[PDB]
Design a protein around this ligand. Structure first.
Ligand SMILES: [Cl-]
Ligand SMILES: [Cl-]
Ligand SMILES: [Cl-]
Ligand SMILES: [Cl-]
Ligand code: NA
Ligand code: NA
Ligand code: NA
Length: 142
């Protein structure tokens, strides 16, 4: 529930640092990825309790000014300076929270494009602590 991501969306397994397509994690649990602690605004290790397909749904490709890109359902939420917002409520030039290249801080990158990009099978992770995770180096909410 809450939206989903293209199967090739990459999540980072904390200990190995291996970037893995979310589709490959289906059925796995009890492993850590990166997530945002919104109180500290710092990245933290977060346990995933479930990884699953939600079926075939419409996807939108969102691209940022730094060149980060993700394909998500219209209802998937991203973090703006004014709170979490559905992809299909985001506007051109609106900024989203993204992890910095190094360290545990975030930066607010500008959206340069949102484009409908067809239907595919889509996937999600449940993160029972922080309810969000990093995918394709962008913070997304459950
Ligand atoms: Cl678990
Ligand atoms: Cl379906
Ligand atoms: Cl909806
Ligand atoms: Cl919204
Ligand atoms: Na490591
Ligand atoms: Na604010
Ligand atoms: Na705007």
């Amino acid at each position: 529930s809450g939206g989903a991501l293209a199967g090739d969306s990459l999540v980072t397994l904390v200990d190995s640092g291996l970037q893995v397509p979310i589709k490959e994690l289906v059925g796995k649990s009890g492993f850590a990825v990166w997530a945002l602690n919104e109180a500290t605004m710092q990245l933290e290790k977060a346990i995933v309790s479930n990884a699953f397909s939600t079926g075939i749904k419409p996807l939108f490709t969102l691209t940022t000014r730094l060149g980060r890109k993700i394909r998500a359902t219209g209802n998937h939420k991203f973090l703006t300076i004014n709170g979490w917002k559905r992809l299909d409520e985001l506007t051109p030039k609106e900024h989203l929270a993204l992890p910095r290249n190094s360290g545990s801080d975030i930066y607010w990158d500008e959206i340069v494009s949102i484009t409908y990009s067809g239907e595919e099978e889509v996937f999600d992770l449940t993160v029972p602590g922080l309810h969000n995770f990093v995918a394709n180096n962008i913070i997304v909410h459950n």
